[PDB]
Amino acid sequence: GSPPEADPRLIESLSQMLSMGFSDEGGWLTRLLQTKNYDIGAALDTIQYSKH
């Protein structure tokens, strides 16, 4: 569902990308999101891979 620290701070870094409605499949964003110290897989997974 909605996890604290595993959704906001994650879905935020996307605020920069999600502004279109697409996830980074070319590893381009991954590097960025990595700024969080973990993985965008979990982040990019919010731009779609789930429910609109």
Curated annotation (Swiss-Prot):
Effect on the protein upon substituting K51R: Strongly reduced acetylation
Residue ranges of every copy of the UBA domain listed in the record: 5-50
PTM notes: Phosphorylation at Ser-23 by ULK1 destabilizes the UBA dimer interface and increases binding affinity to ubiquitinated proteins. Phosphorylation at Ser-23 also primes for subsequent phosphorylation at Ser-19. Phosphorylation at Ser-19 by CK2 or ULK1 promotes binding to ubiquitinated proteins by increasing the affinity between the UBA domain and polyubiquitin chains. Phosphorylation at Ser-19 by ULK1 is stimulated by SESN2. Phosphorylated at Ser-19 by TBK1, leading to promote relocalization of 'Lys-63'-linked ubiquitinated STING1 to autophagosomes. Ubiquitinated by UBE2J1 and RNF26 at Lys-51: ubiquitinated SQSTM1 attracts specific vesicle-associated adapters, forming a molecular bridge that restrains cognate vesicles in the perinuclear region and organizes the endosomal pathway for efficient cargo transport. Ubiquitination by UBE2D2 and UBE2D3 increases its ability to bind polyubiquitin chains by destabilizing the UBA dimer interface. Deubiquitination by USP15 releases target vesicles for fast transport into the cell periphery.
Placement of covalent cross-link Glycyl lysine isopeptide (Lys-Gly) (interchain with G-Cter in ubiquitin): K36
Subcellular location field: Cytoplasmic vesicle, Autophagosome; Preautophagosomal structure; Cytoplasm, Cytosol; Nucleus, PML body
Substitution effect: G26K: Decreased activation of NF-kappa-B
Consequence when changing K51Q: Mimics acetylation; leading to increased ability to bind ubiquitinated proteins
Result of altering P3L: In PDB3 and FTDALS3
Domain of life: Eukaryota
Stated induction or repression of this protein's expression: By proteasomal inhibitor PSI and prostaglandin J2 (PGJ2) (at protein level). By phorbol 12-myristate 13-acetate (PMA). Expression is directly activated by NFE2L2/NRF2; creating a positive feedback loop.
UniProt-reported outcome of changing L29V: No effect on polyubiquitin-binding
Tissue-by-tissue expression: Ubiquitously expressed.
Cross-link (Glycyl lysine isopeptide (Lys-Gly) (interchain with G-Cter in SUMO2)): K51
Impact noted for substituting S19A: Abolished phosphorylation by CK2, leading to decreased affinity for ubiquitinated proteins. Abolished ability to promote relocalization of 'Lys-63'-linked ubiquitinated STING1 to autophagosomes
Positions of modified residues (Phosphoserine): S19, S23
Effect in UniProt of substituting F22V: Loss of polyubiquitin-binding
N6-acetyllysine found at: K36, K51
Comment field on protein domains: The UBA domain binds specifically 'Lys-63'-linked polyubiquitin chains of polyubiquitinated substrates. Mediates the interaction with TRIM55. Both the UBA and PB1 domains are necessary and sufficient for the localization into the ubiquitin-containing inclusion bodies.
Disease: Paget disease of bone 3: A disorder of bone remodeling characterized by increased bone turnover affecting one or more sites throughout the skeleton, primarily the axial skeleton. Osteoclastic overactivity followed by compensatory osteoblastic activity leads to a structurally disorganized mosaic of bone (woven bone), which is mechanically weaker, larger, less compact, more vascular, and more susceptible to fracture than normal adult lamellar bone. In a cell model for Huntington disease (HD), appears to form a shell surrounding aggregates of mutant HTT that may protect cells from apoptosis, possibly by recruiting autophagosomal components to the polyubiquitinated protein aggregates.
Subunit composition and interactions: Homooligomer or heterooligomer; may form homotypic arrays. Dimerization interferes with ubiquitin binding. Component of a ternary complex with PAWR and PRKCZ. Forms a complex with JUB/Ajuba, PRKCZ and TRAF6. Identified in a complex with TRAF6 and CYLD. Identified in a heterotrimeric complex with ubiquitin and ZFAND5, where ZFAND5 and SQSTM1 both interact with the same ubiquitin molecule.
Function field: Molecular adapter required for selective macroautophagy (aggrephagy) by acting as a bridge between polyubiquitinated proteins and autophagosomes. Promotes the recruitment of ubiquitinated cargo proteins to autophagosomes via multiple domains that bridge proteins and organelles in different steps. SQSTM1 first mediates the assembly and removal of ubiquitinated proteins by undergoing liquid-liquid phase separation upon binding to ubiquitinated proteins via its UBA domain, leading to the formation of insoluble cytoplasmic inclusions, known as p62 bodies.
Protein name: Sequestosome-1
Naturally occurring in which organism (per UniProt): Homo sapiens (Human)
Name of the coding gene: SQSTM1
